[PDB]
Amino acid sequence: GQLHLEIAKAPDQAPKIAIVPFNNDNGLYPIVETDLNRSGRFTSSSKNLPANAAINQIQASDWQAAGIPYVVTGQIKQTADGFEVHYQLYDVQKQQYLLNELLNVPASRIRQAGHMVSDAIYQALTGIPGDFSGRIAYVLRNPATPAERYTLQIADTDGEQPKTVLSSRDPILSPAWTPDAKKIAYVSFETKRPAIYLQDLSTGTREVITSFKGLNGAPSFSPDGKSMLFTASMNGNPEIYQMDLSTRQVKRMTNDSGIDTEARYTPDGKAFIFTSDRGGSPQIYRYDFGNGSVKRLTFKGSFNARGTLSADGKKIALVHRPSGSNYKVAIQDINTGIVNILTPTSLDESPSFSPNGQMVVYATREGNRGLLSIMSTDGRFRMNLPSEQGEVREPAWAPK
Template sequence: MKKPLQDFPPTPSSSFFARRALVAALAATPVIPALAQFRVEVSGVGVTQLPIAIAPFKGEESSPQKISAIVLADLERSGQFRGVDASGQALDESSRPDLSLWRQRTADSLAVGSVTRLADGRFDVRFRLWDVVRGQDLGGQSYTVPQGDLRLASHRIADYIYEKLTGEKGIFSTRIAYVTKGGTRYTLWVADADGENAQAALASPEPIISPRWSSNGSQLAYVSFESRKPVVYVHNVASGQRRLVANFRGSNSAPAWAPDGSTLAVTLSRDGGSQLYTISSSGGEPRRLTQSNSIDTEPVFSADGGTIYFVSDRGGAPQIYKMGAGGGNPTRVTFSGTYNISPSISGDGRWLAYISRVGGAFKLHVMELATGNVQAITDTTADERPSFAPNSKLIVYATKLQGREALMTTTLDGKIKARLAGQAGDIREPDWGPFQKQ
């Protein structure tokens, strides 16, 4: 007789289990101060990293935010850049730097700038990027922002530099969502991609799980237990207004957005057993996709919207499968390991990230879909909920370090990791949002 999925040993992927197991797992986690300050700790060395110098911005010693430090931390976290010592130089965007000096410091590129407080309290932030090797001015930008947007301006500078030097779009001005538990209070946060500047979107004495960004970044779908059972809501991030989408008999869980934003895939037990359905993001009557005696859950759409990846124990243990977005016969995707959950598909369609149980440890794995090649990319043992950056170059996930919950990012090869959480932390369920409109 097949062992029911709920009886498997606990895993960090809380959205995969019944309410009782989920609440017990969350209740056992340590307390985090509601406004804990985050910091970025980058570790590892990539094979090829571009050496870049970010000179201290003129005037930033009196600025509430150190622009140059934020920009450098962003670039280093990407795994594509290595910081070069830029101390002892007084430069701004109007300066013509001595590029031979920076070549001696082994920098391939140099960013300089200034930050000035205006009479109305806003800040004028300017920068310029130089190609040190070719001696070229690569342009720059300026932003006039309130104090609260100084970090956003810094992230946009990092985006500009990243795109100019790699040819690919930067993700530093995007946002992440995640959940914390502090005491008996659960909070859904929206934060910058480096974990800073967190704003509470929802707080509740009952668990909140499975936040998922819509493709335009304006809405979050999530599961709340406010009515003492799992119910799916859609939340407008800007206004704070939300609407109930799925509150059927039994469990309503694991929402996933279709790329066009009109539809959610969800896991419902309304007809007995956990099965996959699609439902309008405005609510209404769901359409059943799977017809099995197994537990089918954790759906995620491919970037083109044509395929749904999901987790099922139809083969006797949880594995990742795929099928057409309208249903049909599923095809098994994961064959390495006996327990694979929490699929995430990269925006370019090349990669599948997921959690695999290996000898009792839960570890982040990445599969190249074209070849089926799989690589474990962490040495931690309690990884959960991977989510790709919108440029498909980084993954955010939750794990435990030194016994504490931590929010991490990693490059796809696992060589560059950054810890986004501070020393205290009960942080879980991360989801990386889409590119932001400028």
């Protein structure tokens, strides 16, 4: 675990979830209790318990007395492959089970099993798919390690189980997830000329998507899996290009505005958003594939840039700078245009929505540490992913 997990701002008040230590536990329930405490919507505990419950044995009179609305029980039984977990979620007020599930775990796949159990608990309580399962890509930058100055890594949502995709003495920029999260793309300078690579995460193998003199990078993949957007400045100023994956057909679309830009597809495949200085200030515009029109989306402030789309397609995470203060991570509703400032940030860098749209990851700096921060979109939960050394940049939450 290169990125270690911190909770910075717990939700002020949230329902509590009691989790009874599973009999013959494998180390599973502490992971579940930790996930529930980083859900941004609940808190959980397993130590100072007011009662004693188990599988198919719970009495709600004592859990109400302690003001506990939700209780989780479990049973672990070893199998030939690995172990089984039989877990339940009990609603105390309704006096009924919200979950009664068995999950087969194949041997040393314990952290993924706890995230699955926690994902089911979260969905049973909020109706929103949990995001404790899933991966986040990031680039570790350490000039105090010239051999691995840049390292592209993929880790779990808590930073555990990191997987190094590529390390190099040269810049590695802008990791972008393929629609089904089976492949990852990135801009590499391991050879002097920048090149967008496409790396199969199953077999390992990579391939050069494009590579020339004016390539800026910032890749983004079409929801249909057929096209890719990227930034490149053949001469002078960066511009947005769309590639067709089948024939490597490149042809340009929009911005020759004098600032660096990045294009991000809308999840419906109808359009993409991008940053533009064509109005005299960096704003987020929307290019419609249908008629080729460009429309401004952000109107508040003198600086709106580095926008990304929520999977549902109704929210935009962006970098917002009121001319008085510095960079802020902001959320704008697409339907209504209401801009929600989430938090200050130290880096003019793109945020990334979680698949459920309830979380957002971004790169910032606190103290002398370059770290990743995960915040709930409503602004009450902060989660920190600091590095032991160097800085963490350009996160990309894997989609679902």
